Each structure stands twice: as structure tokens, then as C-alpha cells.
Symmetry: D2
């Protein structure tokens, strides 16, 4: 479990494989802080428990929980039959393995590497969500240790997992409203940043969507608006309601996507996901310590692509059952499962934002 | 802040003054563990916040909270105007300052001493409520440190504050169903135990009530059935409902009390407190991690006696307003205040079990 | 990673395989508390680092360190080339994986099980070394979790790994001066205890050595006086110096061993290990916080038996090089390595007391 | 213990009184992290213990130690007789109460206020010494809580206590090489900064010394080169050795000081302190974990001015006894005591950098 430091994945012959490709398991943290999760985080925990139990039927889950809520998580995972879910002890300031976590790589020859980015809590001292983010910056290194996989460290380059989507071949989907944000690499030019993404992902081309539905939190991550459902085909939220908060950004994205081609050349067969018709109304906001009824993001594009299955969010919206239908179209040969991950949407992020899959090898 | 060790309070000329006597302030901890408090303890916290804000108008409060929920408690106490309530950092396994806390003393000459007992979580490895109780056994010593008050250490003698009630002069009210319990000094005889209580409290006489309404938790503490409302006059729960769970123990106590005299000789003018007509039905028991609707104790005798005021529990029972009336009779020249401390009654103990007053001096 | 609970290893067809048998890796904790280790434990740490680096050349090491000294241990293990040593995050009250750790099992068909005993810090509230031992009682369960191996829980049966030595077939070496100690199963008869050892180890016979060289610490563990070097052949300390502190216990053991046969019937070809000629003189005892020059145990019998190698202690004694020679005789076809594990001998226990090997499978 | 927020000390009629003025006690933290202190910090601790025991004979000490090293500090302070030293529980990333701590104020009418600055570990993410500095930014607020003293919060203004020295009347001694450093208020002009110092200190004039002997650590704090020994008279290091590392900065300072007048008008009767002739050679640097023989600052100007006493550093240098003589001249009517605070000088800062006095009141 060492650290390669004199070369880049591109030279070393590694590449972040498509989320859809075959994978050994999934990694996910455990919510605890009252600063962000209501009611001692008990609800969110149960919400995490389910989203975990869901991956169960498709592959194993690596649930990492802080030492203080360990005995608990283990008593609840055994309470659910306890199949292929393992509880490993791991500290974190907040449960967002998608961002702070490791972004694995592969050389297509069996070896499994990884790229550990710098994490500053989505912004840092300039615009970060919370302050002490040092334990999260450890999560990526720690998880590569108990897995026996070397890693590349992008020094001074702060990037979070759920801000980039990739397809098997040299192409990635970033959101300039975030990667260019001043609280994220303001010493690097849009040119420099592309080069990095090309060296640590092995993407000969970077598609720049241009506004996000995460104005001031994640700073407009792309794992909320679109993604790659297959090398060439992609997903994307789309509504016609000209009075819906995500209308323009979504359409602006759709127009960009549909008019965009990838590396190998094929056009992007853009798909259509739906958006809620009623935003999640935060309740019991009083139990959220400070250092109600306010709207919180709830996107169906926040789904995880395991092998032979899909874990989709079900907020209990009107256009809910439609989401499960739409996703079904995209991945016909994949059982789709849905969970009430609405309770975690009150924390700013969904199913995708709380998982991280590890590509299988041999 | 040293430790006297070669003499006892009796010889040193000190005595635990009556709870009613003049006092400088009140000490209380902060609930946090999910093992005992539902919903991340958020509810219980608010319940503690109030019971705290209540003492506010009578004297200052010393709210000690673990380092992890400090910023929070301070943001909520300032949110309530922030008058004479100070938040000091202090770790604890559970919020029960009444038991683990220090039992102050006085020489009636200005000096303030204290007696630190051994705490084993109400029983210990034999019948304790929880296991790691080492941080609580620190609370008493820690609080005597930041107050500049020496202390006496009763080595190998495990006693908890809320298991004994005292009146100004040589007399204390203990409950043999607890002090004699095998999980509490099974190497000491009922004779030995009395001697200790006489040396560290300066009580020339010990009244032995004989069963409690705390069968298997606190093991029948006396701070649930009765207490001293004035040197000579006492309180005591009493119901005629021969089908009420506390009926016999309460009556058995009343008969004992009324037939009992104190040290100075005067008879005990026994009073009458009421009991709920409906036991607190524990709800949302699922959010209580394990290593619903079950009844939980709810006694009105669990009131704190500050100077010029009374803090009484209000569970929202039928015989509730009656309790406030009854207590009013006892302490006419004392403003009585009541708070919904029902949420903490779900943790096994009330207002009294969560406070600890420090007698003023000069 | 579940828990079998209605049957015992004997019925389930599992058995603790000989320490010498083939093994996948070795588990070991990380010293930190100033209550026991001098100079902030920095020395002991380096001593652990080496003993770890030593196993390196024979098999992989699983170094589990508390979250507070994690970054450190990883910076030091990479500083040593970083080969097959992985640092996993794990909390513990003290580094003694040998005792609190899991005692693996095998069905000789590929499956890997385990038996988790109760740990009370060698005695408990009656004679334990330290008080809070709850985090250590977690170590065994935690390590079985990140390894995907079920376990058996011996409820109310407190036993520590390094108090029993086993040989492939139905036989184990226990030390009655410990297993019978009142601070360890005083509700179980010597008959009952044997039955347990027979059900969770699959040993049809238990050899009872009868005094140990650990009078009041570990309470006379057997992993200090003797062990099984091969099914039938054993090791054992032996000196002729009638003025040496371990003289009689050692000889008393030798006489017992040599006159004892195992399960299958073969006689025990007793061997001879040497003892130091100069006891380790504890220095700088002042840096050891309390809640100098005193002697501390230093036994050469405290060696770990990895596959194709031996890790032996080298205190810098006169009969030191002799120890390496003696052990060499016993395991001719095994490279013997020695490390200055004298610094950890100041903590009460050696190389063996700080490791725990996991038998390989397929 | 509230927070005044709509007015400044200047308007409110408060002013940081001279360090020499009468004071109630002294506050100091407790070293623990292995990232900075060698040998588990055990040595530095003892060094802190002494420097603490020293203040003992002049006034009371408020020793705040993290919860993990509490029992220890209390066992050592009672081991020293235990006079007027109280151990209060308080977490911190590092022991430097001088900087992170509160900078008290007074209205000369009895009331005691304070000014809490922003702390970013001497620089922050730009040039800070360590990363997680959130617990230290709590120390100032926490200590004002257990003392019943309101405070002023300089939002977005990061200043550390030991970077400014004041004399009773409108004058302060800052070091531009630090207060202007880019990692400390690079959004504020030298004009703006002076105004702040004038509003929260009540100093109608700011003397700008111009280079420090702390090149890249504290970034040239002034509490290393000079200070106010009396309103008008000051101290200052001075050597003639043109080959001494502090030569020019010291002389450059002396020339500046001597040519400078204060607010009330009187000239500054500059004094002369000596510098070591041999820099402290860091030893045993290996026991200092990383995320030898190198020189470390050792200034005699790092002395604390209690009432009726002086605590001066004694590194065991050639010009050591001279320092005690020199300081003696300055404060004739003050008993001078010296302690081997060389062990803490290996951490970057001395006696002054680790204390914080609270001005008495009535």
C-alpha cells in the first residue's frame, strides 16, 4: 500500500474505468454530526442502512464508521441478516465517501491503482461547508491501505469524486461552475486543470457543462445534472416547467450535451431523467445544532451504478415512479431498486454522493 | 484543590447541609449517548436546556458538557438570552451529576469541603446500567478542582448522591433496598455502612426506608420516594389506588416515615405528594441503539430545592397540576416552576437525578 | 462476518491449528498509553516497528493503530520501504493482540472461523492491570469483521490468547495458576473450564502446568514458560541456577512436561530454552504517569512461530546468543531472526504477547 | 459570559492593562502532540510542570489540560504539594495559551472584559504550523466562559497574543514582519490593522519594529525581541557579536526603539537583555513523528511578568546567569525565578509563549 510519485496514471497505463463496468464492492461512510444531520443523525443513519442493504443483493458493501458509532452500525447490519456487508472502523468529519474517497484506477491487466485528490470540504476556508476536514482527507489514504492498492497524490490539486463523470475511453464530464470556482484551484488555469484531469483519469477530452443545480453548496457538481450511462450514451435531467428551479440549468445542459461528441467520435445519445415536482421541505430543523421548511436539492440523477443493479433515490415525489421507469429504459438488463434516500437529501447530496465503488480485477 | 485523607468530615467539623439551605449555584451535565437517549439525545438535550434555564431565575447554573457537544450547548444557552449560566467543558459517560457528582460539605465557618464517593454506574460489573463509567468517576474530582474545594475520598465505598437525603442535623434518609444491594458494598455490613454515612455526612442517625420504586435500575434510590422539606418535615409519595404500581412501596414508606423520629427528637411531619395516573409511554424506541411503549418511572418527588424556588417535573399527567399545588403548600415562601422533564424520564431519572447544588459560603 | 451461536467449534468441525502450521499473516496492535509505556511510548513503538518489520520477510503484517497515532505509524512503515505491512485503523486500551485478539479456527476444508473470548484486562475489577478495557474487548470482533470470518462468543468465559498453547491434535497447554485464578471464572470449576477449552479448541486433553513466572501481572500465563514446537515436541525454560527467580517454577514445569503425554499418545519430547542471567532493569520510570530500576520479566520463550521463520527476543543478556542457538535447534528448517524487544518487556510481555497470527486457507 | 458585538473596547471604555500591572492568576495549556514534542511530550510536560510550580509562589495558576492527560497532570500537581494550582479540563491542538488564548481588558472600574482574536495557527492554510487548529480557536472562548467575562470578537482579523506588547497608556509594540505577513490579514492595509489595534487595545499609537528573530515559524513575533518593562521603559535583546544569528535584527530593533517615543510623549528608556552564546541543539529528533541537531530559538526576552515576581528561561547557556542579573536590574522590587524551559524551546516558543495572565479586579 505505497504511493507512486514520479509518474502519472497516463504514463503508468491506468484509467478510471466507467462507473458501470464490473466492480468488486462499494464503499460508504456513516453520518454522525449534529451540525448537519437532524435528530442526532439517527434518521439519516437508517437511510444509510437501507441504501447499504440495497447494494447487498448485487455486491459486497464496505461500511466505514467512526469508532463511536461502530458497535451500533454492526448491531444494525447483523439485525438485517448480515450478508456481505462488512463494518470497518474509520473516522470522518462527514459521510461523503464519493468526494473525499479514493478514485480507483486500472491497467486492464489485473493491477488496481488509485488517485487521491486534495479535499478541502468543497471550498475550504474560502467556501467550505464545515471547518475541520482533516479526518476526511485521511479517508482516501486509509481505504487504499486496507485494500492493498498504491495511489497517486495530486498535490495542491483539490478535486472531489462526485464532480466528475467518466466513460471507459478518454473522456470525462466536469462542471466549470465548480472546478473553476475560486475556492478550488485558483492558481490553476482552465488549461492546467484539463491537463491534470487528462493525466490522472486518462481522458484525452474534457466536456465542460456549464452551470449546476448546486449554486452555493457543492458549487455545482456534475453528479447531480448528468453522467455516462454507457460509453457514448449519457443521462441528464430535463423538465419543461419554465417555473421549476432547475429548468434553465437542466435545459442549458441538455443543449450542451446533445451538441457534444466524445473522444472516440460517436455523438452523445442524450437521455432524459425527470426532476421532482415538489422540493423536499426540511422539517424538525431545530434539532440541527448551529456553530426550517427550507428547500433541499432532490435529484434522481443521484443514482449508483453497481454491476447488475441500480440504486435510485425515492423522495416520495409525484414524478417518482416515473424516475424508476426512466432509469429502467437506460439500463434494461439491470435490476433497479429504489430507497427513501430523502432523509439524506436534507444533508445536501444523495445516494451517489455517499458511495464509492471499487472496480473488480482478477 | 487538594484531598484530605487522614480524617473524616465528622472530626474535621463539616456536614452536608440541607438541600434547602442557601446555595451558590447548581451543577448539571449534558446527555449525549444514543445507548440511552432517543433521537440522538436531541430531545433530552432541549429538556435539559429548559430545566437549566429554569434555575436561571433563582441562581447561577454550571452546565458541564462533553467537548463534542460544547459549541452546541453554548449556542443554545446564548440563544436563551444567556444570563447566569456558564458552560464548562467536561466529559461524562452519562448526564447524572446527582450521583457521580461531588457531595459538598461545610464547617459553618465559611470553608467549603466535599466527599467524593466511588461510582460504579449503579451496580458495576454486577448490575451497572452501562460499562465504561470511568469518565463519570472523574466528574466529582474535576468539579471540585475548578471550584477550589478539597475533598474526602471514600475508598472502596460506592455510593451515589441521589440515594441519600439529609436534614441540617445528624440525620439522613437512605433506602436499604439499594445501599445493601449486593452490587454496592457487599463487603460492608449494614452496621459498617451506617458508620460511613455518619462520618462523611455527620448524621448521628440513619432512617432506613425499606423498598423503592426503582426495582432494577437505580436499585431503589430514595430520591424518588421521599426527602426532607425542612428539618423535621419531609415529603413522600402517596396514592390510594390499590392497583397503582407504586401503591404498596409508597404506603409502606409513608407508614415507616410517619412512625419515625429524627436525631434532635422531633417527630416527622410527613407530607403527601401525588403520583402520575398514567405512566410515561416510551415512544420512538427504535432510535435507541442497542449493544417500545414500555413504561418508564415518572415521580413528582424528583424536584430540586434551590433557594427561593422549586423546579418540579411536569410529565403532562392527570395529577400534574395537583403536584404543583402540593409542592406549593410545602414551600409557600418559594416560587415553584415546572418543566416538561418527561423526555428525560425516558432515561431513568428526573430533574433531581440530573442536578447537584453547591451550598453558598462567604 | 456473522456470529455462530447455537453450536460449538467441536460440533461444527473446527480446531485451533498449531501456531507453527501455515499462516496467511500476523496481527499486532500499537502501544500508546503513558500509564504503562515510558517516554510517551515512543521507544516501545520503535520496538514494535522492528518486531513488525521482522515478520515482513516471512509473511504480511496487519498493524492496527489507534486513530491518533495512525498518520505516524504509516509514515514510519513507509519509511522502512513499506513491503507487505498494512496499517488498519483500530482503537485499543493497550497493545496486546495476543490476549484480547481473536483465536482463529479452521475446518480443514478452507473455511476460517474464530472464537472470541471475554477480556477483562487480566483479572478485571478484581485484579486487572488497568480499568477501561472495553475498547480491547472490541478488538477481537473488529478484526474478524475486516477479514470476513464468523466467530463464536464464549459468554461469561474470560480467557486470554496467550494463556493457552495448542498442538494440531486434541491437546492444549494451560496454566492452572491463571485459568483458576479467582479473577477469572470463579463460577466455573476446573472441570467446567476444561470442557470449554475442549469445545472451542477441540482438545480432547488438557495438560495443567502448575505455576507460572507471572506471579501477579498476567497471573502466570503459559506463553512464558513453555509451548508446542511440533505436535508432540515442546519447549520449556530451564536453568540450574538455584538462586534464579524462575528456577523452581521452570524446573517444576520441566518435570511436569517430561512426565506428560498428549492426546494421540506420544510422549512429550521436552526441549530446553535458557533464561536471562540479568533481569531487565527498568530505567527512566519517572516518565510513566501514575493514576525505578525494578525488575521486569524477560523470557526467551516469548517467540512467535511464523511459517518459515522465527521472531525471537534479544534483551542484550549474557545467555542471549545461546537462546538464538537453542531455538535454531528446535526449528532447523526455519530462519531465526532476533529483535531488541527488551523495550516492550518493560510493559509486561514480549513478542508473543503482542502478536496474533491468522492461519492461511485456500 | 456573553459577547458584546456592536461596540469596541475603545468606546466601551476598556484597555489591555500592562503585563506588569496587578493580576489575579495565570493561564497555561498542556503539551501533548508527538508531531511537535519529542518523547511523547513527557519532557516538555515536566518543563511545563515546573514553569507552573514557579508561578505558584506569586499567584494562582489555571492549568488547562486535554481530557486524555488530565488524571496525569492532577497527579503531578498534587505530587508537588498542590498549593494554588487548579487543573481544568480543556482541549487544544497545541499548548500556546499566549496566542490562541483571550486578551483580557479592563474598564478600571472593576469590570473585566476581553478581546478574542481569530487564530489560524500562525498563518493558516498558507503558512500555519499545523492544520487542525479549530480546538485552539475554542480555547479563548472557553476560558472566558469559566471566568464569567464577556468578550469582543474580531471577525476576520487573525492576531495572536504574543505578537503584541502593550504599556498602560495608548501604545502597543507590534512587529510588521508578522502582522503584515500575507498569511495574516492580506485584505487589511497597514492602516486598517493599526485602527483595529487601536480599537481593541485602546492604543492611540502603534510602534512598528521591523524584523523579527522568528523568520518562518511565528513569522517574527515581537514577544521574542522586546517588550514594555514599565510605561515608558522597555526591554530589548542586544549583542555585539557580528556573527550571531540575531545580531542585526536585534540591533536594528534597538536603534528603532531608542529613537522611538510613546503616546504620552516620554522617550523610551531602552534596556538591554542578552542572547545565548550557544543555540539549543535539538536532540532525539527521531521520536518526533512526521506527517536532528538543528538549532532552535532560545531568547531570554521570553519571560512572564507576574505581580511581585519574574519567571525567566534558563537554557543552560553561557550568558545565562547574566540574563537573571539583567532582568533583576529592570525589576528590582520583584523576585526573579528561573526554570529550565529549554525543553519547550525545542517546540518553538518559551515561557511567555505558553502563559496568559488575567488582570485582577475587585
Amino acid at each position: 500500500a505505497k504511493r507512486i510519485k514520479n509518474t502519472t496514471p497516463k504514463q503508468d497505463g491506468f484509467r478510471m474505468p466507467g462507473e458501470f463496468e464490473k466492480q468488486k464492492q462499494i464503499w460508504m461512510l456513516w453520518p454522525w454530526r449534529n451540525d448537519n444531520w437532524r435528530l442526532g443523525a439517527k434518521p439519516a443513519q437508517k437511510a444509510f442502512l437501507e441504501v447499504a442493504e440495497a447494494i447487498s443483493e448485487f455486491e459486497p458493501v464496505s461500511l466505514c464508521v467512526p469508532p463511536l458509532q461502530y458497535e451500533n452500525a454492526l448491531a444494525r447490519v447483523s439485525e438485517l441478516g448480515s450478508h456481505n456487508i462488512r463494518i470497518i472502523e474509520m473516522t470522518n468529519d462527514d459521510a461523503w465517501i464519493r468526494d473525499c474517497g479514493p478514485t480507483f484506477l486500472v491497467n486492464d491487466k489485473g493491477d488496481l491503482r488509485a488517485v487521491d485528490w486534495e479535499f478541502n470540504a468543497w471550498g475550504g476556508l474560502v467556501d467550505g461547508l464545515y471547518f475541520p476536514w482533516d479526518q476526511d482527507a485521511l479517508v482516501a489514504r486509509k481505504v487504499c491501505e486496507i485494500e492493498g492498492v498504491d495511489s497517486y497524490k495530486t498535490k495542491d490539486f483539490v478535486l472531489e469524486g462526485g464532480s466528475i463523470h467518466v466513460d471507459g475511453e478518454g473522456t470525462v464530464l466536469v462542471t466549470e461552475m465548480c472546478l473553476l470556482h475560486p475556492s478550488r484551484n485558483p492558481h490553476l488555469t482552465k488549461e492546467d486543470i484539463e491537463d491534470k484531469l487528462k493525466d490522472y483519469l486518462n481522458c484525452v477530452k474534457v466536456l465542460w457543462v456549464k452551470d449546476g443545480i448546486d449554486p452555493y453548496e457543492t458549487n455545482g457538481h456534475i453528479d447531480d445534472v448528468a453522467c455516462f450511462i454507457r460509453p457514448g450514451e449519457v443521462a441528464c435531467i430535463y423538465t419543461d416547467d419554465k417555473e421549476h428551479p432547475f429548468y434553465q440549468e437542466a435545459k442549458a445542459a441538455y443543449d450542451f450535451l446533445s451538441q457534444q461528441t466524445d473522444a472516440k467520435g460517436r455523438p452523445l445519445k442524450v437521455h432524459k431523467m425527470c426532476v421532482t415536482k415538489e422540493p423536499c421541505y426540511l422539517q424538525e430543523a431545530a434539532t440541527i445544532d448551529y456553530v426550517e421548511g427550507e428547500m433541499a436539492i432532490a435529484s434522481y440523477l443521484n443514482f449508483l451504478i453497481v454491476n447488475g443493479g441500480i440504486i435510485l433515490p425515492q423522495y416520495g415525489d409525484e414524478n417518482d415512479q416515473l424516475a424508476k421507469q426512466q432509469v429502467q429504459e437506460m439500463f434494461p438488463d439491470r435490476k433497479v431498486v429504489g430507497v427513501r434516500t430523502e432523509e439524506i437529501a436534507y444533508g445536501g447530496g444523495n445516494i451517489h454522493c455517499i458511495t464509492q465503488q471499487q472496480p473488480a480485477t482478477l
